[PDB]
């Protein structure tokens, strides 16, 4: 276990932070859900550029005062539900969030989740990626249900982090 990366999951309640974590970390999904009370913890290790990184993932909530866990995190997945525009709208307030309670030099991925709900899409991929590169966020769309881009999501942010090699 060469390294230890602390990563947080943030987003509005219901967008799928908690199911993203269970897919990525234990390859499990559930339609039925329990609101996350405070924080939930799960962990998984990967290799990038020949190196073993164990990642520690914190599943927070939309119980507003979870802000504490943000500190000392190298990466944060900020998640919105592609099918509920309101959840995408608060992403501006969610990036305002990290710019109040979290490292100003933290790796963020914007994540559109529930890409399987093709017919209910309320946030166009173009509009999102536009805000993505309008800002300093990396971007991807996932489905926790079918598992699309779920590995990709993690592997992107973990690769991005290791790219912080200090000389």
């Amino acid at each position: 276990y060469d390294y230890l990366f602390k990563v947080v999951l943030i987003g509005d309640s219901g967008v799928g932070k908690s199911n993203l974590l269970s897919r990525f970390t234990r390859n499990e999904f559930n339609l039925e859900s329990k609101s996350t009370i405070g924080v939930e913890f799960a962990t998984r290790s990967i290799q990038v550029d020949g190196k073993t990184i164990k990642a520690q993932i914190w599943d927070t909530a939309g119980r507003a005062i979870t802000s504490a866990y943000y500190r000392g995190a190298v990466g944060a997945l900020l998640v919105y539900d592609i099918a509920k525009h309101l959840t995408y709208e608060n992403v501006e307030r969610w990036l305002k969030e990290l710019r109040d309670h979290a490292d100003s030099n933290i790796v963020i991925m914007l994540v559109g989740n529930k890409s399987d709900l093709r017919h209910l899409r309320a946030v166009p991929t173009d509009e999102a990626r536009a805000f993505a590169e309008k800002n300093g966020l990396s971007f991807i769309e996932t489905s926790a249900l079918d598992s699309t881009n779920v590995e990709a999501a993690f592997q992107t942010i973990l690769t991005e982090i290791y790219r912080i090699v200090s000389q």
Binding site: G14, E28, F29, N30, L31, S33, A83, L117, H119, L120
Partner: protein, 465 residues
Amino acid sequence: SWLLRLFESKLFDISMAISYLYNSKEPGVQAYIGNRLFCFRNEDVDFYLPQLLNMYIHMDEDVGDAIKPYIVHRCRQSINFSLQCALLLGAYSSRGTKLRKLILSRLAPEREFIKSLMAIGKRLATLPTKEQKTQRLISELSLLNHKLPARVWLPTAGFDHHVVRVPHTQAVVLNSKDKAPYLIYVEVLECENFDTTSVPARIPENVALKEPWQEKVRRIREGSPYGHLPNWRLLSVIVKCGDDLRQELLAFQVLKQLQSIWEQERVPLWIKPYKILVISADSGMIEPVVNAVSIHQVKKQSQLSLLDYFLQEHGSYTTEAFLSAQRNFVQSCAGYCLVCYLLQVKDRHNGNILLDAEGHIIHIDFGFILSSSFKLTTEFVDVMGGLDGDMFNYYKMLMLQGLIAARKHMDKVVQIVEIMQQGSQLPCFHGSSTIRNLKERFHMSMTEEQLQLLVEQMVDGSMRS
């Protein structure tokens, strides 16, 4: 994964979808199903349009929001669909309003076509006799043919089409009541798709009696400008300008399912759902059954007893036409007995039962059902060959067979009714335990020996008068 497991199984149908959609409090599920609607066949989902639209109105926003996308999608690809949506949206709210206005926003021709039909009916109110009403109608219908063909269709038609002509001379008013309903014949040219095809060109125009349906088409067709085209077909609707049809629709759905249930199982009961079109909570149209007339008027024109009429019209007890008619009699009776029983249909009389040319009976006035507050008269038993008769015994056998069948698919029926009760001001839901009483009437707990006895008891009740 255990839930999603089911939803991804073959077991998943539009029926089930709605149930979970109706019951589940998990918004992730509601939203999941909202999406899955698109994969189902338009036809299957269509049957449940009143439910979906009802829920949209009366349920949590979460529930609505999952449904809306699909609706709009269908609305965008079918104005028929659009129409039917719009009409239902309106009838069932007196949330909804927001969506109706959006849909109507194009459909003006049809809405004026429909307004006019309704308007016609309201005028006949000043004419106190059936016959007087009839004459105003025919005249005023003649006025319709102006704008002869137009971008309007009968939603109640099994198919897509354009209305070209109204053979006004053939139309009739059905009773002498204040806001009497009225029957009309309509000429149409069939489409492959309504939404994409030019309205046909006018063809310049230049007698009504009691006759079978195929004979009336001949007469109307031969007289019609458009009658030469292969494209030409004749439709019919009853227009009720002042009668609520939401119960009428509900019974339809219930009838239609039961019809399926007995078809799926192999129970040769017979029933006939007649299509319903809700226009307002006030008003509607009905697609009428052809080649059939009320028993009561069948007894006033024949001067016969029911059995005798059978004998006159089909033949002696040794004829095929009769035994066939007798079987169809018996089967339509058991069917309609069960329907009356399950739905607790009341106000049952020979004015509300039709007889078709093949021998089936057909019940019609589905006011007085369920919580709102069938007769085996000896005249009926006679047609069956009498109480000791084999054909009568078979009637008892069909009722049990169909009751047993009914239990095996109870939830699909109850679903239909139970969803509809939502936020409902229908008189049939007046009770506290409307749905609960309905389920009890399925006797899910009973053994078949108990049910045999219950069927026997049922028949006995129907005879007392």
